Amino acid sequence: EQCGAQAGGARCPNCLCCSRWGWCGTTSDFCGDGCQSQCSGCDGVGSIVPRDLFERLLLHRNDGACPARGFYTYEAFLAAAAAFPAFGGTGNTETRKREVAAFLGQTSHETTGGWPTAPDGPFSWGYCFKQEQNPPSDYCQPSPEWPCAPGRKYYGRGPIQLSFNFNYGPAGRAIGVDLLSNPDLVATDATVSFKTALWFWMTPQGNKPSSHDVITGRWAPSPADAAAGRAPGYGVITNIVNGGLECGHGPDDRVANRIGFYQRYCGAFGIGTGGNLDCYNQRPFN
């Protein structure tokens, strides 16, 4: 609907802002700078990963047999990403798509329900789970910095399978949610769930860079990294996530599963994966 200074001063119906160029709408484009009328009353990662793509990549997550069925929505992914605008918004477009592919690859592995003969292949069964299956512990390691909340448990939750009081604490503080007190939010609120995974993705810890910096080419190895065989690529991201267990001892099915997801996703995004895909020959960071 047209409006304003070519529409006889017409205001927009439903209290819609009249844009500077004379059109009706609710975005900043209509209501901000230049807005002709009803301005106060009467382009992020979504451009790189559209709903259709997200849904096709995460093809079987809403299977009846997936305990997280229905939980991980596109709306929650976008809302979470809005809090981490550098995610999928750093570097050129190819790099942005690759960040999202890599993030989705790693988190799909953490939450996979796949099996070798699964419909549409094992790499379409990411995001099947939202909490650790049969956890062996509540993962409380008390500290003055992050005391364990009584009655609460810190088993894996969400797309990065966030675990331990000493990770829920920092994650919650960064995102403005008290996850030490209410760790179950990571499994009951999908926006919080995605936010903890993005927090992990975006945050350097100890001798590890952020996954974000690695995938966007902002990380260069240290001497110690170089002697350890740690060169930029998806492999070092696997190392960051779980290198203590999976890295430095040759071909490993967990690492390969992470790769297969990443390859399928890069495929769908029309980009290459880049090199150094594995951590078969890398010293674990830890």
How far apart are alpha carbons 78 and 89 in whole angstroms?
13
For residue 157, the enclosing domain spans 131-187
For 242-274, give the secondary structure using H, E and C.
Answer: HHHHHCCCCCCHHHHHHHHHHHHHHHHCCCCCC
Please give the biggest Cα pair distance in the chain.
Answer: 74
The kind and range of the H/E element at 17 are: strand 17-18
What 3-state class would DSSP assign to 198? Answer: helix
The tokens 């390969």 sit on which residue? 256
Task: Name residue 2's beta-bridge partners.
Answer: 23
Count structural domains, the chain.
3
**Tokens at 278, concatenated:** 């594995």
- Say whether both 202 and 62 belong to one domain: yes
- Say whether both 277 and 143 belong to one domain: no
- Say whether both 107 and 215 belong to one domain: yes
- Say whether both 106 and 235 belong to one domain: yes
- Say whether both 152 and 279 belong to one domain: no
Which 8-state DSSP code applies to residue 232? S
The dihedral built from the CA positions of residue 81, 82, 85 and 90, taken in this order, carries a sign that is positive
Experimental method: X-ray
Catalytic residue among 55, 75, 110, 246: 110
- Say whether both 164 and 115 belong to one domain: no
Q: How far is CA 173 from CA 32, 47, 132, 181, in A?
A: 32, 29, 22, 11
How far apart are alpha carbons 82 and 216 in whole angstroms?
18
In whole angstroms, what separates CA 101 from the centre of its chain?
Answer: 10
**Tokens at 39, concatenated:** 């301005």
How far apart are alpha carbons 102 and 120 in whole angstroms?
20
Angle at 112 (CA atoms; ends 265, 50), nearest 5 degrees: 35
How many CA atoms lie within 13 Å of 210's alpha carbon, on the beta-carbon side? 17
141 close to 127: Cβ distance less than 8 angstroms: no
The tokens 């439903």 sit on which residue? 14
CATH number of the domain enclosing 166: 3.30.20.10
**Tokens at 62, concatenated:** 């809403």
**Tokens at 232, concatenated:** 């930029």
- Say whether both 21 and 81 belong to one domain: no
What 3-state class would DSSP assign to 53? Answer: helix
The dihedral built from the CA positions of residue 234, 236, 239 and 241, taken in this order, carries a sign that is negative
- Say whether both 95 and 121 belong to one domain: yes
Task: Name residue 131's beta-bridge partners.
Answer: 157
- Say whether both 232 and 117 belong to one domain: yes
How far apart are alpha carbons 198 and 192 in whole angstroms?
10
The kind and range of the H/E element at 91 are: none
- Say whether both 120 and 170 belong to one domain: no
In whole angstroms, what separates CA 189 from the centre of its chain?
Answer: 14
The kind and range of the H/E element at 24 are: strand 24-25
- Say whether both 196 and 60 belong to one domain: yes
**Tokens at 131, concatenated:** 């909490």
State yes or no: is 110 an active-site residue: yes
CATH number of the domain enclosing 16: 3.30.60.10
- Say whether both 210 and 245 belong to one domain: yes
Q: How far is CA 226 from CA 175, 211, 222, 247, in A?
A: 33, 17, 6, 15
How many CA atoms lie within 13 Å of 169's alpha carbon, on the beta-carbon side? 14
The kind and range of the H/E element at 95 are: helix 93-110
